[PDB]
Amino acid sequence: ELDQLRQEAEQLKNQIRDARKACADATLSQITNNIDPVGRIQMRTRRTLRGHLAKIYAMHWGTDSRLLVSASQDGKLIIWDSYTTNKVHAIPLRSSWVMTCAYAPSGNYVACGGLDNICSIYNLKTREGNVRVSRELAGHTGYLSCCRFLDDNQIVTSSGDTTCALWDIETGQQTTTFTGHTGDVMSLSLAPDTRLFVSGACDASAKLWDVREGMCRQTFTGHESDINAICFFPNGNAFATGSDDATCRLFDLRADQELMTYSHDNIICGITSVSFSKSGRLLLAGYDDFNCNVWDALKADRAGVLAGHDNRVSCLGVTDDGMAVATGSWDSFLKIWN
Amino acid sequence: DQRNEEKAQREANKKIEKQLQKDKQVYRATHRLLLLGAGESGKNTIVKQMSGIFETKFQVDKVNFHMFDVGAQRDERRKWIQCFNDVTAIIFVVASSQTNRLQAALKLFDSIWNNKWLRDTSVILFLNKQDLLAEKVLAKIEDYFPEFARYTTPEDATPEPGEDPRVTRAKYFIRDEFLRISTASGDGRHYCYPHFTCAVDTENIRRVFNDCRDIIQRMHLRQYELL
């Protein structure tokens, strides 16, 4: 029976491949060739944030485009005021091996975790004025690689056990498990309407998940190695991924096909992080060469670079409004560009 | 009237920065160690004789050591291995001797040593269960490592009294198998410190201490162009 089920799976895979070929009338590169290029982009560092001692693994912008949360390997989270560069909080962690963090859209909570397989949720707004742990979420058996906030009572996490999960923060119980990956899950991204999310994994694939049903709606392939970063397009009908093969790819959720490849002969390093600008025209990615390249998302041309790091770039993000891009690296510094 | 809020933020930084400075003193004076080993490795005895991650703290001669043991993580090491790229040392425990467990350990050592992010991290290597190797050999290596048939005891070998020369050859053969990898790939940035220990031995606590010292000393000697 096993050989026949395998043959059936191969037949379905071939049917899917032909179904996708049937829609491949033209590539993106044959349409946007009539669009003027963005030209040279020269961003400059405006502010530098100092205080972490260990390599910084995660950074996330809040919804007011004014506060940042960052996490280093020391066992600390720092809340920063990007405008005045002043610190707001410095939260000690139970363990130093923190790999991800997230800022709640309400500004009330901060989530983080990593090798302890526990997602810790801190309440930043308490009557005593002291930051306290409000919840510890546990169930995941592998390391925690990414956390995202849907609402104050709902959080989406991913772990190294190939399973994503939706947690009910107030009750502390896991409510939805998303399975089907075979490698570690590296990065999550939520849809603008937070009904769908996409999960990239160390399988050279990504999956489009239905937040409400618990069903995996689409599976995307195309990368040659492990996927390290994923980011939804501003419109919500496409996402960009980065992998260890030194290529970045844009996928279309409505055509279930790869749409564009971003690569260069001189780039042989993986892509630690991927992010889009407010208009979706610029794609930014951090590399292992201690820099960041800004790509024209509609042309696959390089628009410019962000150089100012001496160690691996670990994270990148853009403000909701779009006024600034912030990055972090293993140098224990955060920088803001303009 | 907005100056009152700005003043308040300055006060917060003063409180935070002073605390960060205190923490910095604690951070730099603490020596972090990563503990890895074979599935049959006596890691529980490595810890006893000294979730997803466990922490053990030691104070050895007024020096604070922090050892992290990998808990219930997936067998795929290539992603969390990068995180431990700034520890003082990696302690790798391999049991000598059903698959060819030693070849698996050599393959893991190789991959860890040649990792682009671990090029500056030294490895302290413990070879455990010496009595099982000794009994197996005196009671086979050539069926797994044919070159052992032509191996001779190093001229600088210092075996304990009472050891069977066949056992001493097996121990040095295995040690040399690890050392050839370390020597061939190393470029003076990090070193391997192999040791031959017993399943139960409290002396291991000083072996790590002394090795950590030498690692740091040679690091500084490299910096001062003396070594």
């Epitope: 075979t182 490698g183 160390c202 399988d203 050279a204 392939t221 040659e224 190695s225 492990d226 260890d244 093969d245 030194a246 042989i268 993986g270 | 997936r74 067998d75 795929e76 090491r77 290539r78 698996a104 393959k107 893991l108 190789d110 991959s111 860890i112 040649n114 990792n115 682009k116």
Partner: nanobody, 126 residues
Framework: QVQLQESGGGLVQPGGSLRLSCAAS????????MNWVRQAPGKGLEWVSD????????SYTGSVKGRFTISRDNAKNTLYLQMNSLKPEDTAVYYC?????????????????????RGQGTQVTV
């Protein structure tokens, strides 16, 4: 999507030989190190052979030295294995595996848990 499909298996008498193959797709073959691993009927996966991207450096487990050889052809994306002077001890399912990242020399591909870049394997009964 990347695939590895083994071939050239079968049953042979002691002292005989086989030539195994492995077809790869979905990735640039010449940028990755390739390995052969075996699954023993009653034992966990064991590494057998490791060939570098260029074919310049080939490593074998001690138990197969002088009996097994490997090669690769980067113009065909094909990995082979010559299995000579076989004994009952060599009965196993053989798999052709790929190192997880290009342009590197560190590999973790004999994991008990489902490995993403491993083929289905071919049974070599002797």
């Amino acid at each position: 999507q990347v695939q590895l499909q083994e071939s050239g298996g079968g049953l042979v008498q002691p002292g005989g030989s086989l030539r195994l193959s492995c077809a790869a797709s979905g990735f640039t073959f010449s940028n990755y190190k390739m390995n052969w691993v075996r699954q023993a009927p009653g034992k966990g996966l064991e590494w057998v052979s490791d060939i570098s991207q260029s074919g310049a450096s080939i490593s074998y487990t001690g138990s197969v030295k002088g009996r097994f050889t490997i090669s690769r052809d980067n113009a065909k994306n094909t990995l082979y294995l010559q299995m000579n002077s076989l004994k009952p001890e060599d009965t196993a399912v053989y798999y052709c595996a790929r190192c997880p990242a290009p342009f590197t020399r560190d590999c973790f591909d004999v994991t008990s848990t489902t490995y993403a870049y491993r083929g289905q394997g071919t049974q070599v009964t002797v």
